[PDB]
Amino acid sequence: KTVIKNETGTISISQLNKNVWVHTELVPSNGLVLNTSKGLVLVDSSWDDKLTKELIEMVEKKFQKRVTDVIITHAHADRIGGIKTLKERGIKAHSTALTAELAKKNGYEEPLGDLQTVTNLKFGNMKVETFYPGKGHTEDNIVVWLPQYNILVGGCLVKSTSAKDLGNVADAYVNEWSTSIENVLKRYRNINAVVPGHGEVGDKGLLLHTLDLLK
Ligand SMILES: [Co+2]
């Protein structure tokens, strides 16, 4: 897989696919860059505004298209933190209503609150499904599915192999997280890659790992 870094090793993009890339910023945090016929779409932005601006500028320059949309997978900072940058640049920031409600409560600018339990979006030819599986890492966590690739973005709901515990559980629902993981396994029975919130890309084994960490 082709991999491209900025000057610092602070931001790195790894090609999963002709049109799907994983972005990682330095903990490392992951999201996706979707190279579509109508622009770039990000699944998650970055830790804060400084890194979000750098991420956008890197990908706009490389791919020679604008970032048009971001999907925010929960209302914590590794996730909501670049919202000011998105809003001021006219980048549409999609989220569930609950994620937007939580962002506002916590003093962040609000994403759109447009995503339902299951939402199907199309960006050029790129199909994206968002799914709220229930509570887990947070109340509001969603996953994102690319049905043309059978790629799942697990976000913080899904732990990497290298994670040997659940991490920050202060906002977690450790008794509903296993059911939520089961909901993802039931919906998506044939998965090619799973992108955890943090750590190396894997497959359905990451979901099984997360289940074991919850015991
Ligand atoms: Co989080």
- Ligand 1 centroid–CA 177 distance in Å is 13
Structure tokens at 193: 């890659």
Q: Which pairing describes strands 151-155 and 143-146: parallel, antiparallel, or unpaired?
A: antiparallel
Residue 3 CB-density burial (10 A; 0-12 exposed, 13-18 middle, 19+ buried): exposed
- Ligand 1 centroid–CA 74 distance in Å is 7
Q: Residue 168 catalytic?
A: yes
Q: Residue 74 catalytic?
A: yes
Which residue out of 44, 69, 78, 140 is catalytically annotated? Answer: 78
Residue 137 annotated as lining a ligand binding site = yes
- Ligand 1 centroid–CA 40 distance in Å is 24
Residue 212 annotated as lining a ligand binding site = no
Resolution to 1 decimal place, in Å: 1.5
Q: Residue 137 catalytic?
A: yes
CATH number at residue 91: 3.60.15.10
Number of domains in the chain: 1
Adjacency order of strands within the sheet including 11-15: 3-5, 11-15, 20-25, 29-36, 39-43, 67-71, 92-94
Which phi and psi angles does 136 have, rounded to 5°?
Answer: -165, -100
Could you tell me the residue range of the domain that residue 103 belongs to? Answer: 1-215
Residue 209 annotated as lining a ligand binding site = no
Solved using: X-ray
Residue 168 annotated as lining a ligand binding site = yes
